[PDB]
Design a protein around this nucleic acid. Structure first.
Ligand SMILES: [Mg+2]
Ligand SMILES: [Mg+2]
Ligand SMILES: [Mg+2]
Ligand SMILES: [Mg+2]
Ligand SMILES: [Zn+2]
Ligand SMILES: [Zn+2]
Lengths: 184, 365, 365, 184
DNA sequence: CTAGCACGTGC
DNA sequence: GCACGTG
DNA sequence: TGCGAAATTCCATGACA
DNA sequence: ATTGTCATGGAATTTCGCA
DNA sequence: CTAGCACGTGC
DNA sequence: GCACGTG
DNA sequence: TGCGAAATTCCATGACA
DNA sequence: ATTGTCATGGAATTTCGCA
């Protein structure tokens, strides 16, 4: 009955393995439920350690009341449970094989996978240096349901980097073929 | 020569008539209530004042008192200060006795991310291989990011700021003229991102007051947290960052976190006044909070201060003088007055230089 | 437990009656004009204040504002300052916000040779193998003797002073607690001659103000005389000594030479007012001059200063704190109050120690 | 017609050679004419150099209008003349073989030679360390003609080291014999 | 940005 | 490498 | 519409350099 | 072309609970 | 008591 | 030698 | 018993640490 | 058991030469 707020819920998940970029292989995805704000941390493994290393950074900024994830091994470990308990964070798991978040979080997360894959095309190995730009883009693009960007909802101001261009996010013809060759 | 008139009994402007001016031992002399004094010819006075001043390079009175031992003439001090004004060594060695004007108190940035203030702390005791901390303070909120580094380099600053600017890009970053921040490498990194670099006048940490003051708090917390324990701070940085970002500023009645996001996160003693409002209602409440913040005003001037004027002769303090060397450069001219505390001078090396008035004295005489 | 009375509707001193105190989620709660707050049982409050304070070791208001987010109870701040008073880390790390009292201005010594003030200047740039200068200033006159040495040792001080004390023996020699002056060797040398040694409170150069201030003049003259010339000062010492001993002090209207001997020697611009008097007439004129010298008075106190009281809890500033370490020792007690600016304390190592109040803060809370 | 003053005239002279004391052989004697105040500097030679070294020290304290001496080689040199001229000091010489000063300066100088010789008896080689005491003694003992000590006349105050004891200054019997042996 | 040097003193 | 400007 | 005390605000001080 | 700052704790002032 | 370190920049 | 207290 | 200007005194400021 | 100081130069005040 209370209106949703930032820091109410962080939706976390791993993406990968990706092609190696400066020795990194995975992306940890953190999405704030209320605002759609996304943090992306690169890791070497979908492990409790990497998760803890990265989230220890994020939680120096802000601590969520709740973290939500799939039943991934990194998030179901005892170590991760004790980590969360120490910081007063409640852990929440979706039942196995039935991932669930919200329309907003399903849509941002879809955007992420698609945005990552589009830039990963010519640059299979240079994705590390691009994580800042990705994150800025996602966070400065206008929601369908509400009129505001995530940035707007989190900070209560315009951004100094407004992504005026919505682009295609779909693959072009030349991109599709040079991406098909990536395997062969 | 022009003293002949006196011995005869004629009058000349400057020499009072009621005095008796006689001749002894080849010299023109006068009887004065302090005793009998020698009156030298105008052509000899400039050298007398020079000799007296040079004994110990004394200022006005201490120079006058020497001369007055043997001599009298009209307007002695006028001749004395003429000398003082031309003694290169006194001008570049003597202290100022004029205080700087009252400090400015620049408007708080309007929005978060408008202006960042940055600085390096250290060296610190080596901790897990690390020696320095990059402190980034957002002007409006005070929200502060701490990054541990192995050196105060551009390269470590870039790496650190690439992480930070994943959240948001600032309009401006202000720093001191640390080599790390003045490199063309950092110039380009900032240009590429549309960030304008703004620099403190040199040798004037006041100008990074926002971040410097934050350094104080960081160190004070670290210190306390390390009492009776070896000084290994690397693991404590995140704790301190978070702690300070959530600490109330009694004068504001808000934490920099609260000023950044408009709501506490899940930290101890989280404020929950706004639990019943929608985020929208919360954000507009935040908007009023940000605009209604207390802004301090410049203090009253001191009884004997100076404010610089275009065209004024002025002297920049020698940054780092060697032992037994002057503390001031030669006189320079005020080219432009940026505000009552900042000035452009054509400096001793013949370049336009922006300087704080605290690093200046007005040339005297 | 004692909160049961409230829920029922009974009254207890400290809890205003016009408020409604209900129960939710196992906790006793009150409706207040700032919102609904939790009232903890007295047995839980001491630990709540501890938790809130410890997040960033905040003082009164910044601690209160955290607690106030979730809780209310009568006289919250009384409990808060109780905590602040018992936090060892805040007491030994926090700065004072109380200024020292007004400085004393001790009576000028009556006679020459009553009190000498001594000090070492240096290291200086090596000049003819020499690195330091022993500065000896006679309190009454200001007459100053400069001795060049290769080290600030007792042995060089003795040698230097054997030369000086061939002219005359002083009653007292005052110095800082430099190793050269606190050695038992120098203790014996002084005892043998009937000279009483008097020492400044530690880390308080103010107390050797007479000689320190003279160091300023020495250096300023040396500097000027060495402009655009390599800094070789050894040969200039005698010149400077003589120059300064014959320099007028505008406020006094006399040179330290004149105050020493009552007559100029054969130096440039020698004063000769007394040429007609016998030495006897001259000496009694000197006697009146010495007694009639201007004596400055203590300034007005600052709006928020402290003066120490016997029995007061007080903290000595840590002389030379390591990086990230506290700047204050644990609280100590004022044993004796020598004057409103000097105090004896039983120090942190369990010894009687004489200290300047500038190196003290009153323990707060 | 003007009354005599301190710094009006310094009477200088050498005493020695003495037995070597910390490598020193001579004493330069400086007596202020008006006050009787004595400075004594040890030297290695009765040379212009030694004279200049020592007097450069004394003249950092006070400069005499006039220095007076016998026609000793150290004081008649060109170098010494230029030295004096640079400092505005007039040099004055007694005609050769007719030394002349004043009753006061003749008497102090006699005191010096006698005081030095008395302490030089048991201590032919330790006289260097004693020069301070000698100087203090001479300067703190009451004049016959006037009631004041030199110290008194120079500084206008009592001394903190009043030499209440006038001693013998004459030699004792044991002193005379151990001094006669000094040669053999 | 803070480090180091100097001396005398006491295991 | 090395001297300078700024922290 | 007034009193005593607690709560709040004021603000000199010092340390970041 | 750039510019001091703010936590701290006694003290001064205001607010509040109760008549 | 003052020295030194650090970086980036320009012969 | 080495650690400390003061400049 | 007054005016203008020169002479003197006043005193905040900074550097010795 | 010990304690700030004083040169400096604009500004404020006083003194002085002349009516
Ligand atoms: Mg997954
Ligand atoms: Mg800096
Ligand atoms: Mg000292
Ligand atoms: Mg002879
Ligand atoms: Zn000069
Ligand atoms: Zn604390």
């Amino acid at each position: 009955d209370r209106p949703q707020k930032p820091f109410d819920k962080f939706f976390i998940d791993y993406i990968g393995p990706l092609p190696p970029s400066q020795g990194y292989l995975y992306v940890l995805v953190v999405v704030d439920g209320m605002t759609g704000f996304t943090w992306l941390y690169p890791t070497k493994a979908p492990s409790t350690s990497a998760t803890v290393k990265s989230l220890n950074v994020l939680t120096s900024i802000a601590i969520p009341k709740v973290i939500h994830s799939d039943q991934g091994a990194a998030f179901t470990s005892s170590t991760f449970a004790e980590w969360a308990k120490e910081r007063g964070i409640h852990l929440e798991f979706s039942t196995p094989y039935h991932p669930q978040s919200s329309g907003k979080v399903e849509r941002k997360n879809s955007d992420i996978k698609r945005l990552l894959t589009k830039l990963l095309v010519g640059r299979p190995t240079k994705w590390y240096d691009l994580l800042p730009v990705v994150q800025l883009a996602l966070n400065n693009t206008y929601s369908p349901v509400l009129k505001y960007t995530p940035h707007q909802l989190l900070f209560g101001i315009d951004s100094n980097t407004p992504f005026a261009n919505q682009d295609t996010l779909d693959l072009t013809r030349e991109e599709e073929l040079s991406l098909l060759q990536e395997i062969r | 020569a022009e003293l002949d008139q006196l011995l005869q009994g004629h009058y000349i402007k400057g020499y009072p008539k009621q005095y008796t001016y006689f001749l002894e031992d080849g010299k023109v002399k006068v009887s004065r209530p302090e005793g009998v004094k020698i009156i030298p010819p105008q052509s000899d006075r400039q050298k007398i004042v020079l000799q007296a001043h040079n004994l110990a390079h004394t200022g006005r009175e201490a120079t006058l008192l020497k001369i007055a031992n043997l001599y009298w003439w009209p307007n002695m001090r006028k001749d004395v200060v003429k000398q003082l004004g031309r003694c290169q060594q006194c001008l570049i060695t003597n202290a100022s006795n004029k205080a700087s004007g009252p400090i400015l108190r620049p408007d708080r940035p309007q929005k978060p991310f408008d202006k960042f203030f940055i600085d390096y702390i250290g060296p610190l005791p080596p901790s897990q291989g690390y020696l320095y901390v990059l402190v980034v303070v957002d002007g409006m909120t005070g929200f502060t990011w701490l990054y541990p580094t192995k050196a105060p380099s551009t390269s470590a600053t870039v790496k650190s700021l690439n992480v930070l600017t994943s959240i948001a890009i600032p309009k401006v970053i202000h720093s001191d003229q640390g080599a790390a921040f003045t490199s063309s490498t950092f110039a380009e990194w900032a240009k590429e991102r549309g960030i304008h670099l703004e620099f403190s006048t040199p040798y004037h940490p006041q100008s990074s007051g926002k971040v410097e003051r934050k350094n104080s708090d960081i160190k004070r917390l670290l210190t306390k947290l390390l009492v009776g324990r070896p000084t290994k701070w690397y693991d404590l940085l995140p704790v301190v960052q978070l702690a300070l970002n959530n600490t109330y500023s009694p004068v504001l009645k808000y934490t920099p976190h609260q000023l950044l996001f408009g709501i506490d996160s899940n930290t101890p003693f989280a404020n929950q006044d706004t639990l019943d409002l929608t985020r929208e209602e919360e954000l507009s409440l935040l908007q009023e909070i940000r605009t209604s913040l207390y802004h301090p005003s410049t203090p009253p001037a001191s009884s004997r201060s100076w404010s610089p004027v275009v065209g004024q002769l002025v002297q920049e303090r020698v940054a780092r003088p060697a032992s037994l060397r002057p503390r001031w450069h030669k006189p320079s001219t005020v080219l432009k007055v940026l505000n009552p505390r900042t000035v452009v001078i054509l400096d001793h090396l013949g370049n336009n230089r922006t300087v704080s008035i605290d690093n200046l004295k007005p040339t005297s005489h």
